[PDB]
Amino acid sequence: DNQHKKIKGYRDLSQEEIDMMNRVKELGSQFEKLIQDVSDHLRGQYNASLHNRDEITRIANAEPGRWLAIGKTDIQTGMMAIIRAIAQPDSF
Amino acid sequence: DNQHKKIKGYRDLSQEEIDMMNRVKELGSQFEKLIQDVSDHLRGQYNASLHNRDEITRIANAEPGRWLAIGKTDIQTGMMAIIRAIAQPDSF
Amino acid sequence: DNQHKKIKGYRDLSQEEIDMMNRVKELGSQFEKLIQDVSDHLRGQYNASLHNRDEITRIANAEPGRWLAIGKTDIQTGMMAIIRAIAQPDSF
Amino acid sequence: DNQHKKIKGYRDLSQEEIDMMNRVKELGSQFEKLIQDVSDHLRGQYNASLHNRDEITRIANAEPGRWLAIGKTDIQTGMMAIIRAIAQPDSF
Amino acid sequence: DNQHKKIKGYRDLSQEEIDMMNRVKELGSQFEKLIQDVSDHLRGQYNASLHNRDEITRIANAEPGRWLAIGKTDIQTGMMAIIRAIAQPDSF
Amino acid sequence: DNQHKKIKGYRDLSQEEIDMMNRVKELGSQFEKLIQDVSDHLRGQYNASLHNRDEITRIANAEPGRWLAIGKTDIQTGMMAIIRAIAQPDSF
């Protein structure tokens, strides 16, 4: 029982606080399925212009899977900070 | 007409690409209304524990409006990078 | 009981995992006292060169309390990501 | 002699300033040994659940070495900004 | 015609605004050629100390191509935010 | 003499390395004058639409001085990481 009460910074939460943290996570699921859709598209448009070197140089220069990775990380860290704003740990 | 074709890095987009960029922005609207809801909550719980100095020190130490600001920025920059992954500008 | 088991992404943790998360937080306390020491120093060197406009322009241009704020945020988000690496939530 | 006086933004430092910058770096050594310990743990728990596909999918989905990498970078950039707050270069 | 007027957040821009966004991108080209020069240098100093294990351990510990990658990303996201400050989309 | 040789992580630099670090800082001066120009523009377009509440709500919603601040920080941290890639400190 109660493993998070062993971690420093635990605060008792309301249901209202817990509902807001699950609403953050629910919306992050919708971003997850969106990034998966963008990843499928990038993988489709890379394979559908095989042997066309000008478009493969165009995709290599645009670096879109890297930017999709930067986008996923910032969505996730943003969710973590909104959750921190709601949970409010008494710890640095 | 066509002001973005004056900006360096313009690429012609498909409707499929434009639909994906508007789907990013639509989901960011849902995060916008969520952060507004969290902001209303923090402003409610600050005012509802006026003159209780221990809880005002507890809110001051937790810094939740600052973390909500860090959360909003990272959601926005994450949306900007996913949109960059789809639009793919031919520019640094 | 068990409020974090109501939040999506909960995973059962070992004591070894809990000890590592508290070791992250303990070290963040040492960074907290360090940033407090740097903040006291900046507030000391601002007041100890009152009316010297060249040094007040030198402090204003260097922007050190802003950089100390950027430093505190990155220490905190770094602690949050190491804790995420240990806790490993089954959620986006 | 004096190679950093060839770099734009050099400022003469006190011993008090130099002691604070070395205290930042000393504490970053303690974070370095912590991240090494977390890295050893993740490499241990990956190998100790070889051929269990459900736990390898659980580790792959949690992405913990990636989050440990995000955590290391933010600890380092946070140390760089606290050091900038102390050193205060006269340069953008 | 006018594909960016299909994307949510479009605002009509002045030539003064468009000149400022192209001035951001022009300066980012100068940073691009700089990072390419730094990348060539790192690749030169890695190959020019092959079989010297102490210097290869020194380069591996310093992690400079990783820091050059962190530097390129932050230059790019900084350009994106200055452009956002000028373009000012009416969207989250 | 030699205050940076008292700081942990000092490495002897070449002139080629010092020239590259000053070339980073020179280009950051050009970004500094650019952000100053963007700041003057935002302050001009705020004052030139005083008492027009729809445009003041449009500027308040777009948050451009905040995005200019996010842009300045990321340009600066990007310069710091490129300089770290060149200087290569033997320290965490």
Residue F2 tokens read as 């030699």
* Cβ-based neighbour number of residue C8 at 10 Å: 16
Quick check: do E and F touch, 3+ CB pairs under 8 A? yes
Residue F90 · residue F4 · CB < 8 Å: no
Q: Which residue do the tokens 């629910």 mark?
A: A26
User: Closest chain A residue to C83 measured between Cα atoms?
Assistant: A7
- Tell me the residue type at D73: T
D10: left (phi over 0), alpha (psi -120 to 50) or beta: beta
Reported structure resolution in angstroms: 2.7
Phi, then psi, of F51 in degrees rounded to 5: 75, -15
Distance in Å from the first CA to the final CA of chain C: 25
B46 annotated as a binding-site residue: no
The subunits that touch chain D, with at least 3 C-beta pairs less than 8 Å apart, are: C, F
Cα–Cα distance for residue pair F31/E27, rounded to 1 Å: 7
Cα torsion D65, D69, D71, D75 to 10°: value is 150
Q: Is E40 on the interface with F (CB under 8 A)?
A: no
**Token pair of B42 as six digits:** 């923090």
Quick check: D92 contacting F, CB < 8 Å?
A: yes
Distance CA B14, CA B20 (A): 10
Q: Does D25 touch chain C (CB under 8 A)?
A: no
| Chain F residues closer than 8 Å to E41 by CB | 16, 20, 86
Q: What was the experiment behind these coordinates?
A: X-ray
Which amino acid, B30? Q
Q: Rounded to whole angstroms, how far apart are CA atoms F66 and F10?
A: 36
Nearest 10 degrees: Cα torsion E59, E63, E65, E66? 170
Long-range contacts of A43-52 (CB under 8 A, 24+ apart): none
Residue E84 token pair = 């956002």
Which residues have C-beta within 8 Å of that of residue F42, sequence separation ≥ 6?
E85, F64, F65, F68
- F30 contacts on E by Cβ (under 8 Å): 27, 30
Shortest distance, CA A64 to any CA of chain C (angstroms)? 21
Provide the 3-class DSSP secondary structure of residue B65. Answer: helix
Q: By CA distance, what is B10's nearest residue in E? A: E4
How far is the alpha carbon of F90 from chain E, nearest alpha carbon, in Å? Answer: 6
CB contact under 8 A, D4 and F3: yes
C-beta neighbour count of A29 within 10 angstroms:
12
**Nearest CB to B7 within list E18, E32, E84:** E18
Instruction: State which residue of chain F sits closest to D12, comparing Cα positions.
Output: F3
Flag whether residue F12 sits within 8 Å of chain D, measured between CB atoms: yes
Q: How far apart are CA A72 and CA B82, in angstroms?
A: 8
In 3D space, the residue among C92, C60, C75 whose CA is nearest the CA of residue C28 turns out to be: C75
Cβ contacts of F30 within 8 Å, gap of 6 or more:
E27, E30
Nearest CB to E71; choose among F81, F88, F89 = F81
Exposed (0-12), middle (13-18) or buried (19+): which is C52, by Cβ within 10 Å? exposed
Contact B53, A24 (CB under 8 A): no
Chains touching C by CB (3 or more pairs below 8 Å): A, D
